[PDB]
Design a protein around this ligand. Sequence first.
Ligand SMILES: [Ca+2]
Length: 88
Amino acid sequence: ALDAAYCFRNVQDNCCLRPLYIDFRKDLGWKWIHEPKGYNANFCAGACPKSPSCVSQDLEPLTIVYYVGRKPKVEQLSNMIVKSCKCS
Ligand SMILES: [Ca+2]
């Protein structure tokens, strides 16, 4: 698939997964997530052979930490990480 294993290895103008690190506090303005400080969300871009767009395919969740007062709470966020792309 058009995932990290294939794309991050060989550069190409074609549709592929692209690295992208997001800092929750600094980029999104989020004060809610205390751990991790950020994560690799990645994204999709590139030439597609109608004329498709390079878009996400499979998504993965992210486990984070938020607070109710001072108390740490664990929670799985859905659709946070892009693991593969596709032409559609
Ligand atoms: Ca959840």
